[PDB]
Design a protein around this nucleic acid. Sequence first.
RNA 1: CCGGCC
RNA 2: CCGACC
Lengths: 458, 431, 470, 471
Amino acid sequence: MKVINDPIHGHIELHPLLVRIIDTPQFQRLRYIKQLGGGYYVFPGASHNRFEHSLGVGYLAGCLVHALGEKQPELQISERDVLCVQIAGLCHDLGHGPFSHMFDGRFIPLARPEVKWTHEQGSVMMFEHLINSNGIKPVMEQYGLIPEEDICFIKEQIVGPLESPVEDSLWPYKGRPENKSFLYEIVSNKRNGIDVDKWDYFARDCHHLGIQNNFDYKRFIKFARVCEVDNELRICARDKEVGNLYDMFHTRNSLHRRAYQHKVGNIIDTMITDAFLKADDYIEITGAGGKKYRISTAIDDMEAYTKLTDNIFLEILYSTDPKLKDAREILKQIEYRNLFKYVGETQPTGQIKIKREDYESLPKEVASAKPKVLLDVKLKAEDFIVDVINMDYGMQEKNPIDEQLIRVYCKKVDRKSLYAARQYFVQWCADRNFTKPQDGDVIAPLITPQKKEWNDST
Amino acid sequence: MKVINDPIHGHIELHPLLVRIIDTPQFQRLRYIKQLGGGYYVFPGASHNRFEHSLGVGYLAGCLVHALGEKQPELQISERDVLCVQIAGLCHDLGHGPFSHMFDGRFIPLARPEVKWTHEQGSVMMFEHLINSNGIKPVMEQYGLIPEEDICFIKEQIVGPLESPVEDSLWPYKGRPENKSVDKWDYFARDCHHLGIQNNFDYKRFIKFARVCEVDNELRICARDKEVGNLYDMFHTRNSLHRRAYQHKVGNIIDTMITDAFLKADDYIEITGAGGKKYRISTAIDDMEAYTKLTDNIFLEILYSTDPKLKDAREILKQIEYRNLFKYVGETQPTGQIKIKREDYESLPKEVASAKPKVLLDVKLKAEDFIVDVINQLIRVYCKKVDRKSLYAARQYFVQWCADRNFTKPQDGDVIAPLITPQKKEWNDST
Amino acid sequence: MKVINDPIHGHIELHPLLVRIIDTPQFQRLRYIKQLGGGYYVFPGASHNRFEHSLGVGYLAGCLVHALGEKQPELQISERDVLCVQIAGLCHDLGHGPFSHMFDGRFIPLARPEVKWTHEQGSVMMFEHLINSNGIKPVMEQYGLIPEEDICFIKEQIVGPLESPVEDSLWPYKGRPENKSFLYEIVSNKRNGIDVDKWDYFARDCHHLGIQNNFDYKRFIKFARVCEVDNELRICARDKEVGNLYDMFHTRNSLHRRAYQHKVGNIIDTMITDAFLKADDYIEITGAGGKKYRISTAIDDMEAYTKLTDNIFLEILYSTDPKLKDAREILKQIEYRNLFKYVGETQPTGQIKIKREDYESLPKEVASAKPKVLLDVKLKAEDFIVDVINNPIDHVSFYCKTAPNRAIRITKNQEQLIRVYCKKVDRKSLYAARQYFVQWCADRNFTKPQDGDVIAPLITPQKKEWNDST
Amino acid sequence: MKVINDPIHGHIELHPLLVRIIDTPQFQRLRYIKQLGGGYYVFPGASHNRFEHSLGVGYLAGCLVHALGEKQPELQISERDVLCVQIAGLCHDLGHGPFSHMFDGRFIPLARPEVKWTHEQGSVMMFEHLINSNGIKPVMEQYGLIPEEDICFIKEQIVGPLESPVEDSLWPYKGRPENKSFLYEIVSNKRNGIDVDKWDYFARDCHHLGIQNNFDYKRFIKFARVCEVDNELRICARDKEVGNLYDMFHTRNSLHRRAYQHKVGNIIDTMITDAFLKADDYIEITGAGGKKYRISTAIDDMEAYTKLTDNIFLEILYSTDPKLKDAREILKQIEYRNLFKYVGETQPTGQIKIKREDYESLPKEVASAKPKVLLDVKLKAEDFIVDVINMDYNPIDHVSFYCKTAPNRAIRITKEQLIRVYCKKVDRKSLYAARQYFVQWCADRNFTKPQDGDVIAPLITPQKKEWNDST
RNA sequence: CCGGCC
RNA sequence: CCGACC
Ligand SMILES: [Fe+3]
Ligand SMILES: [Fe+3]
């Protein structure tokens, strides 16, 4: 058992097995990839990496489990359950890619349109590989828990429903029973949204970025207890966390609308992702048997998944090879904060939402926009841009109870080039059937008038 | 007008010249080093970038200049003084080495013994290189600033001494006024905020409680007579932060391991810059081109290469692939006048490796397996070995070396040495 | 320019006129009036008086009006109205009598059923007496105020429209023209209940009772802004502080269900009220011109109401007079802690709510309630005591975004109790009182007791009027 | 086994005997005696009373004795001692008069200068009256106490040695044998100054005044063990809390510099004292047998002293008797804030001091000043007042040392009277004359020259050679 | 600055 | 479980 001090988490004490397994290099790659991701180009202070966020999530899940077992001993969950919860929370986001939010949102979504997968499956696979490489089976036996069940429980908590839930009204998870889901929801609240990881992320972002955290998660955990709803085990705020929970929801909205939904930071992230894509074949990491896998193709290789940090960006910034001139230009452009210029903002309408495969064609489709306007420079794939920041979850019914931001970036920063990019963005919005801009009366003095809808003020 | 959002000083007002300087390749690359260095391993919450600390210091300096100008109309504060303050607060540590203090305090001895230089020389060279590469001399001129004079004044404001005279022919201010007379407070506040260390002193109160006074017919900074509590709290916070950054057990181990990794891969790492030069990590300060490609990425890159030619070097990362840091024995304090100075910095590990204690020992280490690092007067004792017998042998050798150095007696020297500590009659005086 | 240090609001920096109003007999009388009333004999910590509460209320009213006036230079909030709101805050409780809400609550109605008296009317009367006796009016002239308007405005802020508001939907206040309709929302508010009085006494009660106060009025005051709702200027809050308002109302409910509705803090109040009643006819209090008023009629004169404070309690406890022997006796039964025992509680069904004018008639009906089974003890009329005791998205606006009169004010939010106490404490007496209480709760169309089935099995089915839960 | 909620100590559990003792008229008399006395008219939040103070002190004494008997079983602390220490903590202030320390600090020594009276004597007498009147002795016998010696023990804890020894006449206390000496330092220590009463009233004063209280008695009781010090078992603390103890003393100093010496709470206390002194001969209080006792003599009979609380203030304020007129007016000048002005402050030099018997003679000497200047104000004894604010009598002092692994060797112990003169008249020339008279009187009495003494000393200053000597 | 004294 | 129901 070892205790560490953090700005928000506080005490980092754990079990002897968890203490022994915490100081590992497999989860050190979390410390080498920023959880804030594009926040380095956004938040001057919030340079925290996935290690701090994951440790806070695990500690908060363990504290919640301890509080539930103390105030509600009817669960009869022994120390093995808490140890398994801590081991699972130690890998909350231990399967993402370089720059975190850029990989599963921009890099993985574009590198392999034919293979759509997010950080969840990658996290499960990476945690399984790390467990296999550690060889902590005798150590787990010294902890009193059988590995053949601890590994399954950790994987189920990390991923979720891993049994391909059929329409039958059985247990969706093959690890947890019909009356054993109370402990696994502390790591992530897939329905209520009150997750230890989410609260830790919100608090850390607010603290290291300069925002106000009015939530008191400790009181929520103290007053939560285990209750029965819809003939199932759950956790809810008893009577007096309505103000605290509403403040937490407002803070989450502020964080996800001011930091994860900014403008310049999204442009910087898009430029970084595009530069990595142009250099995908130029940074090959050694794999198993002496083989090599590209950073683009390493999402299915754990040798380079354990070797996928933001140092790839550093390699891109300090390439010692002569074949990376195309990526060197983008690296030099991003070195002096000379990234692209935003042409506006947009959001689609209706229930139709594009998949991961359509993201790759979205840049080409947005560049292919061509209204009846003569442009000095044609909006090509490398000249124009379609930045599609997908918004996971978000649409939660009765947030107290309980698509994608589109941006047009110009590779050229000339005034005439800016006007051409704005015209191309208007053409793309018309093609995608997007609503008129808020300042569209001036932003589109020659593109909006083409359609009679703009003139129909009534 | 550019605004930078940081939790140290909120928003920082930067004019077009200040914005261009802050938005520069060197300024952007300045955020690639750690203030706490290896202590980031020991303390997770402290991972701040150096560029943010420099920006906060510059904002504090600009605010102080504005307050001095507004409070005293007779001060006649023009744009030149504010521009010099901003340039200094920006390039105060512009070219700080890998992990800032770690490189310039550990890696210089193994870099090039012929020329000695702290982080100040590298900072001055990096600022000069940034000015040369930016090509914004007309931009600075259009703001009313003299380029050479401002650059020299900013460099002098840094630890580096502009002039040779100590106090006879003015001060080390060959381009500045010796009579004429902050960053430390801003850095301390940033470190306290990042590491979670409570700071009882507010930087704003100290900034607002400064005045220009005529002492010895010279302008000097004077504080309020009722601000002793703020001063004390500030000093306490600074000391606490310094101890946390330097005295960290894991930090210390990471430090020494970083230096070992840097030395081991001298013939397996290099850079490219002007003239197609291929210089190793030892020559990263003499040439500004080497400093341009400088980042803490080695702390991962040297740890991530998968080549057989560096397999043993890769094995250094293997020491991190199974977490086991060097054991801590103890420390002591200097006595008399004999101390391990910078000249003895490159010889102290060799002196430790050559020790022959007269005690029952079975495990010995060579120069490469023995590390002698001091905290500069306390010198800690860390043994890279993991065996209990090896640790005891290393402790006995360290005790013999300290007894031959006649240093201060340790806290529990009787337990560490049953006879070696008893050998000296001077150190056995319990009264 | 005094400043008063407070353990809740810190510094309460004042104005010379407020100091003149404060250092008077009629304001310092508040220094000996319990804020929680009888709650001191149930909560040892709640020893605070109305004096500091009134100081804090004046402070908070000044803070809110000053914040609104500095934020918005269009409302034309002058220093005159700021001072007038501060005066209304300080004088909002000048009319309290012995043991605060026990006096105009359970005492005066049970003593004088023919008079409608409230502490706000007493506040108006005491403030008029304070400005007349102490010669404040020349000072009010000095400091920019015009008494002929400002005094009426202060009285209206304390109690409401003095002049029997006319039927048409005109402006019912004769003090301020309607273009300052927001100013009548600072001190006392009935539309939504966001008034500085409630903030101050919630914080003070939580400080003195050990309860934990989560609401933070400073955040509200910062967000507080005047917005236009239903063509009238009102004070609203930023949409962020909605959770803070939830906390405030949670604190309100806690203070009500733990402090102000205490099971035994009301028994003690009943005993004190009975002691005052028995001593009402033998405690002469002098008025203006030597006219001796009693406890109950002292509300008809402000020279005799000024001399009427909590000391009356002890003035009956220390009596050597034989005429007070009964009343003093009751007070003694409290020092020994020999209080009346609880019997049961009930709630009113529908809208037929018992009023204060019927309070003096309440026990007799309980006396007329005799259970349909044998009773060992036949409790007389005075042998039982029947004591009566009186959402977040109310008419409260919520400033939407960066727009002055945005007025996002819907949010769609997305009676009384009766307690029976027994003078006798025998087991058979307890059973008889429980049976009589069950009979009363089963025949007066009132809700059945919480534990009525265990309190009395032969007085449950009395009538069908009080046996329907629909 | 009831429990009382306190804003300071949270839940306070009480033995049935403690409740029986609490629910008596003599104990409930404390509800109507303010803790800070005249500080209310200065600190609006400081309206708390002695009743909750006594409750909390009993709580703390019980907690400390229980801890000390749980850690070390060789001390052999039994339930009898626990109940006796708790009772002593409860009744340690049963004898407080109106406005607390003002009664035995300013009123009684000035109303009856020939009578010695401390509130500990009144506490002992009131406790005896409580026990006798309320039939507590049968209940004390029932639960385990033996009144003949247990009551003597409680009285000794309240006041000290019930008899008169000289220097070394063996063990003074007849309550408990010497091998339980520590039991006499819980409720009221006189050597170390660490007693469970000061903890509670420091916490309560800081709660109601808004001052910050960094001390934590829980972390003291947690690490307290009894150790031998000069062949006397004493309660001792871990050295790891010694710095914490510093905080407590720091808090103490704050409370004695802001609250108890406010220079406006003292002039208000003086005005209340003068009003009481003038209404003394006419206010009647009935005692046992109907014998009317005045306010001053009421201390001699506990039945009359039970009915003597802060209410007397209001009883003089709300009166209509012509004989009380003057007294009543001095209470009304307080209600207009038309208080008397402080002419000056000084301190005694060396070891010269004013006792409780010379307080009455002090104003006459103050009025007896004869400055060698043209003083147009003929100030008499009624035109001046002299308040001797006796400061109550160290971070180490009788320090304690519960050093780890050393449960026997406690060797780790390593680390006045103000006089304020006020003037009844309010004329500016009268104020200057009063300042000059105060300076002259302080010079004549060899007292320390005031810091602002020379401000109103343009004529008689050259007369005094020592006054001009700055060294 | 007689309910303020960082 | 009459100064408790945190
Ligand atoms: Fe009220
Ligand atoms: Fe006491």
